[PDB]
Design an enzyme around this catalytic site. Structure first.
Site, PDB file in Angstrom:
ATOM      1  N   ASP A  19      55.942  14.260  23.328  1.00 21.89           N
ATOM      2  CA  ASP A  19      54.946  15.091  23.086  1.00 21.89           C
ATOM      3  C   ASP A  19      55.248  16.259  22.805  1.00 21.89           C
ATOM      4  OD1 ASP A  19      54.545  12.468  24.302  1.00 21.89           O
ATOM      5  OD2 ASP A  19      54.839  13.010  26.906  1.00 21.89           O
TER       6      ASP A  19
ATOM      7  N   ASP B 290      53.909  19.152  24.459  1.00 23.96           N
ATOM      8  CA  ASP B 290      53.985  20.176  26.094  1.00 23.96           C
ATOM      9  C   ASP B 290      55.305  20.084  26.316  1.00 23.96           C
ATOM     10  OD1 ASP B 290      54.537  17.157  26.786  1.00 23.96           O
ATOM     11  OD2 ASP B 290      53.969  17.578  28.792  1.00 23.96           O
TER      12      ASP B 290
ATOM     13  N   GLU C 125      59.091   8.842  23.849  1.00 26.44           N
ATOM     14  CA  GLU C 125      59.556   9.519  24.851  1.00 26.44           C
ATOM     15  C   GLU C 125      59.842   8.246  26.219  1.00 26.44           C
ATOM     16  OE1 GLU C 125      58.063  12.778  27.131  1.00 26.44           O
ATOM     17  OE2 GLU C 125      58.454  14.412  25.458  1.00 26.44           O
TER      18      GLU C 125
ATOM     19  N   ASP D 185      57.510  19.986  28.634  1.00 28.91           N
ATOM     20  CA  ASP D 185      58.848  18.983  28.751  1.00 28.91           C
ATOM     21  C   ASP D 185      58.776  18.236  27.041  1.00 28.91           C
ATOM     22  OD1 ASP D 185      56.926  19.569  31.087  1.00 28.91           O
ATOM     23  OD2 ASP D 185      58.431  18.284  32.266  1.00 28.91           O
TER      24      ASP D 185
END
Lengths: 98, 135
Positions: B93, B95, B19, B97
DNA sequence: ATAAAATCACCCGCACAGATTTTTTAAAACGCGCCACGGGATTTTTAAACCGGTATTTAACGGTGTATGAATCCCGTTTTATCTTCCTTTCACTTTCTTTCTCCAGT
DNA sequence: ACTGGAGAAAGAAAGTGAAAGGAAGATAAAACGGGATTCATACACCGTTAAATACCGGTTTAAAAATCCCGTGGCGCGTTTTAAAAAATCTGTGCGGGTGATTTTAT
């Protein structure tokens, strides 16, 4: 740094284990590459980095008609493989510089 | 921003997508330089399903990704035999998002480069979210 | 309006590598002049060809046992042919500034 | 009728976005040149002998060496130019605490 000689072919390479204090490795590699590109240092054919979890390892390969020690001395003289450190001890004593 | 590997055979090489710069540095400091490469990104990427072709071309992250893949675009000079890595891994990641970004990347890959998905050159990584210690 | 991820300028000292900038020095040049050297015409002497003969010294020839030259296969080196590019340039267009022409209210 | 302010027209000068093109770069295909193998085959070294050549004694003679007179151009001296190398002087840059600022995506 040191020089290693192949047993059979006789080719020799330079291996770097440690670098001076407060020196960036990437900038050093870029500077060496720039010096080689403009033909200011002669006797270099390959250049790559192989540092891993074991430790630092930089590999430099010389040409067929070059001496490793001369190239190493030129790298000492022109690159950041050797640097100068100026000692200047100043501290505050009773609120005064000294 | 690319941290390329040393292997020259495309069948023995891998590429990682992350990211941002923090994750990029964390992955670069703990990779295997011989046959692994890292390519960072910048935040959420454009949604090519709602956008136009010229708008997609004018983007920067998409252009960087296309240049890194080295296959071409537009289905005119797009040759699926020029792929430089035979293993593409998505690692975001843990999570929500990350899931959103994964959906966006999957949409891009399916809509623009179907042959890569058909041949089976896309993988998904599974990093953990929690660590528990007792004694 | 809440989320995800990024980027740049300057101040303060000090040490050193690299890029101009004067400053000095050795090589090349010009003008004038003189005497060292080479051409031309006699004397002198000696190097080599020529007759012997003799006494060695070399090259062509016949066996063995290698070292190397042509052929093949590669990989770094250098050339040459082939793409993109930033400054020069005008140029039709647009914009913006300067002067002029009325209106026109007031007395 | 006359005056002075103000708004609108009209005209000229400057900034502008777009322009072939060309020297100046840059990037690939090609031709090249320098090492590792693989032997068959021509080359190096050793005994034998006929023949070709080196060597000595004494002439000679024609050619080259030696000698003298002279008249010049080729070195030598003094004084300027002019590149070339060396010493001197500027220009950047990064280390670590401080001051202040920028951008792109999804719904």
């Amino acid at each position: 740094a040191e020089v290693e000689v192949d047993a059979k072919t006789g080719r020799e390479t330079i291996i770097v284990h440690e670098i001076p204090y407060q020196v960036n490795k990437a900038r050093l590699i870029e500077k060496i590459a720039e010096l080689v590109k403009e033909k200011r240092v002669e006797g270099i054919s390959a250049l790559r980095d192989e540092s891993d979890k074991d430790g630092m390892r930089i590999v430099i390969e010389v040409k067929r008609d070059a001496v490793g020690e001369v190239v190493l001395n030129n790298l000492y003289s022109q690159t950041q493989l050797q640097v100068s450190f100026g000692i200047n001890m100043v501290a505050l004593h009773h609120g005064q510089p000294k | 921003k690319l941290a390329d590997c040393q292997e020259r055979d495309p069948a023995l090489s891998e590429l990682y997508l992350v990211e941002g710069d923090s994750a990029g540095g964390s992955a670069k400091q703990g990779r295997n330089r011989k046959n692994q490469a890292i390519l960072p990104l910048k935040g959420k990427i454009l949604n090519v399903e709602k956008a136009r072709f010229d708008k997609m071309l004018s983007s920067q992250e998409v252009a960087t990704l296309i240049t890194a893949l080295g296959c071409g675009i537009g289905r005119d000079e797009y040759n699926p035999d020029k792929l430089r890595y035979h293993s593409i891994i998505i690692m975001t990641d843990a999570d929500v998002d990350g899931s959103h970004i994964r959906t966006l990347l999957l949409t891009f890959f399916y809509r623009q480069m179907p042959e890569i998905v058909e041949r089976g050159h896309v993988y998904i990584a599974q990093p953990p979210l929690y660590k528990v210690k007792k004694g």
